[PDB]
Amino acid sequence: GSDELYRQSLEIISRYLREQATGAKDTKPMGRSGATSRKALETLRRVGDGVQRNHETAFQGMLRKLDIKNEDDVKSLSRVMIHVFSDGVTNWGRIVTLISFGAFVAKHLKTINQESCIEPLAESITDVLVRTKRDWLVKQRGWDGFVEFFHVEDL
């Protein structure tokens, strides 16, 4: 057996956070369910880049409040993400906003240290989403439902 939903989620989230932090796209192709993962990653680029641009002042404010000191300093962010969902509401708008702020934190990490790693961050986001909303994600057909919910044109 295996946890393919976790694997696929971490790959999409890690890829987006890495390319956002480094400014360079990763060329090696994706693994299992590459079609969905590619479209999902493209959807995240289109939507998530817009969320960051359109809320950049609020995002900077949030960064200031969290005062993230290094690549391992993600416990408060984890608590925030759990808190976001603690009213019992789950939807793709909330999820893409958390991933978008993740990419914003990733760029921040690079400003304070060029050698900063993004894996601790991507894992903390992936953990909240996949572990605490596993069955919701499955019911929505995972990243296919993500692609379909935003239905970006000319992917």
Add this chain to the structure above:
Amino acid sequence: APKEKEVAETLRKIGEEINEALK
């Protein structure tokens, strides 16, 4: 932590805004 709740409330508000727009 009071700051963590303010951040969560802000992310939730943005997230609902995006969800209402595509709903």
